UniProtKB/Swiss-Prot annotation:
Distribution of this protein across tissues and organs: Widely expressed. Expressed in myoblasts.
Disulfide bonds: C60-C77
Function: Serine/threonine kinase closely related to AKT1 and AKT3. All 3 enzymes, AKT1, AKT2 and AKT3, are collectively known as AKT kinase. AKT regulates many processes including metabolism, proliferation, cell survival, growth and angiogenesis, through the phosphorylation of a range of downstream substrates. Over 100 substrates have been reported so far, although for most of them, the precise AKT kinase catalyzing the reaction was not specified. AKT regulates glucose uptake by mediating insulin-induced translocation of the SLC2A4/GLUT4 glucose transporter to the cell surface. Several AKT2-specific substrates have been identified, including ANKRD2, C2CD5, CLK2 and PITX2. May play a role in myoblast differentiation. In this context, may act through PITX2 phosphorylation. Unphosphorylated PITX2 associates with an ELAVL1/HuR-containing complex, which stabilizes CCND1 cyclin mRNA, ensuring cell proliferation. Phosphorylation by AKT2 impairs this association, leading to CCND1 mRNA destabilization and progression towards differentiation. Also involved in the negative regulation of myogenesis in response to stress conditions.
Annotated organism of origin: Homo sapiens (Human)
Subcellular location: Cytoplasm; Nucleus; Cell membrane; Early endosome
Quaternary structure and interacting proteins, as annotated: Interacts with BTBD10. Interacts with KCTD20. Interacts (via PH domain) with MTCP1, TCL1A and TCL1B; this interaction may facilitate AKT2 oligomerization and phosphorylation, hence increasing kinase activity. Interacts with PHB2; this interaction may be important for myogenic differentiation. Interacts (when phosphorylated) with CLIP3/ClipR-59; this interaction promotes AKT2 recruitment to the plasma membrane. Interacts with WDFY2/ProF (via WD repeats 1-3).
Comment on protein domains: Binding of the PH domain to phosphatidylinositol 3,4,5-trisphosphate (PtdIns(3,4,5)P3) following phosphatidylinositol 3-kinase alpha (PIK3CA) activation results in AKT2 recruitment to the plasma membrane, exposition of a pair of serine and threonine residues for phosphorylation by membrane-associated PDPK1/PDK1 and activation.
Residue window of the full protein shown: 1 to 111 of 481
Similarity annotation: Belongs to the protein kinase superfamily. AGC Ser/Thr protein kinase family. RAC subfamily.
Mutagenesis / variant outcome for changing E17K: In HIHGHH; exhibits plasma membrane localization in serum-starved cells and produced inappropriate tonic nuclear exclusion of FOXO1 in preadipocytes
Stated name of the protein: RAC-beta serine/threonine-protein kinase
């Protein structure tokens, strides 16, 4: 199996500071039920850049919340990720629904 394309690409806000601040990261979701977060938008064909954040939604489930900010996504299932992402924020309310919609549509084929 190796024919998974990208389903949705957008910027997400994740906390990353000594205080309570969230920074925007370019996240890309694929049809395999997994989306990776990138600090910037790298895309060099001569020196492909590795993914910084790896988020997988094949198992367990995520829940939409409003804390600390509105339109936020929380997940309680750590399997084998280098970073510990419990809750992440989206760029907008319409984007929060787009991510949830993709997870449900990809879940149909993910099984």
């Amino acid at each position: 199996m190796n024919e998974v394309s990208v389903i949705k690409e957008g910027w997400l806000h994740k906390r990353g500071e000594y205080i309570k601040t969230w920074r925007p990261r370019y996240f890309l979701l694929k049809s395999d039920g997994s989306f990776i977060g990138y600090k910037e938008r790298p895309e060099a064909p001569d020196q492909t850049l590795p993914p910084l954040n790896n988020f997988s939604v094949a198992e367990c489930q995520l829940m939409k919340t409003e804390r600390p900010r509105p339109n936020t996504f929380v997940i309680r299932c750590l399997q084998w990720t280098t970073v510990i992402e419990r809750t992440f924020h989206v760029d907008s309310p319409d984007e929060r629904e787009e991510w949830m919609r993709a997870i449900q549509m990809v879940a149909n084929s993910l099984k």
